Amino acid sequence: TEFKAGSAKKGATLFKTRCLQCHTVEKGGPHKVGPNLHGIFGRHSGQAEGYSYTDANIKKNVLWDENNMSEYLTNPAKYIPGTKMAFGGLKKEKDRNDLITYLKKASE
Amino acid sequence: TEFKAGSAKKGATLFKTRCLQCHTVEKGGPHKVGPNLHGIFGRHSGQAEGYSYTDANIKKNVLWDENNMSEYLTNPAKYIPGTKMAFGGLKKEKDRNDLITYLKKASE
Ligand code: HEC
Ligand code: HEC
Ligand SMILES: OC[C@H]1O[C@H](O[C@H]2[C@H](O)[C@@H](O)[C@H](OCCCCCC3CCCCC3)O[C@@H]2CO)[C@H](O)[C@@H](O)[C@@H]1O
Numbered sequence: 001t002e003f004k005a006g007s008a009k010k011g012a013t014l015f016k017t018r019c020l021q022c023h024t025v026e027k028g029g030p031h032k033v034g035p036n037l038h039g040i041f042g043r044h045s046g047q048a049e050g051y052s053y054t055d056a057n058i059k060k061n062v063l064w065d066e067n068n069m070s071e072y073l074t075n076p077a078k079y080i081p082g083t084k085m086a087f088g089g090l091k092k093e094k095d096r097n098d099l100i101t102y103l104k105k106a107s108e
Numbered sequence: 109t110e111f112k113a114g115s116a117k118k119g120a121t122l123f124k125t126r127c128l129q130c131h132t133v134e135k136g137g138p139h140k141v142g143p144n145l146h147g148i149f150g151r152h153s154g155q156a157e158g159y160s161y162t163d164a165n166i167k168k169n170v171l172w173d174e175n176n177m178s179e180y181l182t183n184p185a186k187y188i189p190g191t192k193m194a195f196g197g198l199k200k201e202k203d204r205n206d207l208i209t210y211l212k213k214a215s216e
């Protein structure tokens with residue numbers, strides 16, 4: 001399902017405990033590991049002034065709104081280049097086919 | 109789409125360069141960061157003798173075959189507990205609603 005208006009008060013606590021380590025939100029606030037998020041809604045992803053992103057922002061692009069940010073926050077790590085390869089991820093279907101054809105024989 | 113028989117020879121090289129760092133495949137081979145994979149096809153996930161898994165193996169369970177291992181190898185990290193939370197992931201839809209309701213106000 002989709003976004004439904006919730007508790008800004010609980011959301012303030014979630015931001016402090018889950019986001020502030022890598023993001024500020026106030027206008028003119030500093031970048032950290034992640035970019036300052038002022039004005040994030042209504043602008044496109046990957047364009048904060050003064051911050052340079054991973055290659056994700058030439059592979060993906062959204063106009064942030066409540067719905068697609070809700071989907072994003074289920075698993076932001078999967079959009080970081082390298083996360084999938086870290087524990088053996090194989091982007092190419094043909095590579096997974098080759099690996100599995102081998103593993104079927106090698107593990108028998 | 110689904111699994112199609114591929115190149116065991118290319119798959120052998122993929123295993124050596126992408127899997128061997130954390131897995132052995134031979135019968136009686138040692139565990140490493142990950143479990144030995146002998147006999148993996150046809151047994152259920154999360155049951156290698158002598159290895160104790162993350163909580164993933166009480167949340168997820170498959171009978172490994174070519175198809176579901178192909179899906180798994182697109183992104184194994186997303187099944188490791190903690191990966192999603194690491195960069196701000198919020199499992200509960202109500203938490204994402206609360207966060208986003210706050211962020212909409214705080215970032216304006
Ligand atoms: C707490 C739940 C959050 C929220 C609401 C967001 N993050 Fe992060 N984030 C981090 C990094 C390194 C990036 C850039 C990624 C890249 O360059 O590929 C981001 C990006 C975002 C965005 C997109 C910003 C844009 O300008 O498009 C958004 C909306 C976002 N984040 C929200 C790093 C981190 C963390 C470091 C461990 C943590 C924790 C979070 N983010 C948590 C959150
Ligand atoms: C190279 C592409 C591969 C392949 C084919 C597999 N892996 Fe891994 N793996 C690792 C860990 C720590 C685990 C256990 C996770 C947990 O306890 O939650 C696994 C698990 C697997 C399985 C499931 C095994 C089972 O008994 O059900 C399979 C089929 C599998 N892997 C295949 C760790 C790593 C790595 C450490 C960085 C790397 C690299 C890989 N795995 C790569 C691969
Ligand atoms: O993988 C299967 C899914 O693919 C699509 O979902 C897309 C969505 O359509 C697509 O809009 C979404 O994009 C999210 C991009 C998030 C941008 C993150 C930015 C962060 C900072 C730097 C640049 C990137 O990615 C999803 C896949 O990861 C389909 O829409 C879904 O129906 C389908 O379930």
Ligand SMILES: OC[C@H]1O[C@H](O[C@H]2[C@H](O)[C@@H](O)[C@H](OCCCCCC3CCCCC3)O[C@@H]2CO)[C@H](O)[C@@H](O)[C@@H]1O
Nearest residue numbers: 153154161162163164165166168169170176179180187
């Ligand atoms: O998230 C949306 C998707 O959900 C389902 O896909 C499931 C599959 O049905 C489901 O079979 C699959 O399970 C994979 C579990 C991999 C087990 C990994 C083990 C490794 C070692 C320790 C225990 C776990 O997880 C997928 C979701 O992550 C649906 O089937 C899909 O159609 C749908 O696109």
Ligand SMILES: [Cl-]
Nearest residue numbers: 091092093094
């Ligand atoms: Cl492809």
Ligand SMILES: [Cl-]
Nearest residue numbers: 199200201202
């Ligand atoms: Cl829920």
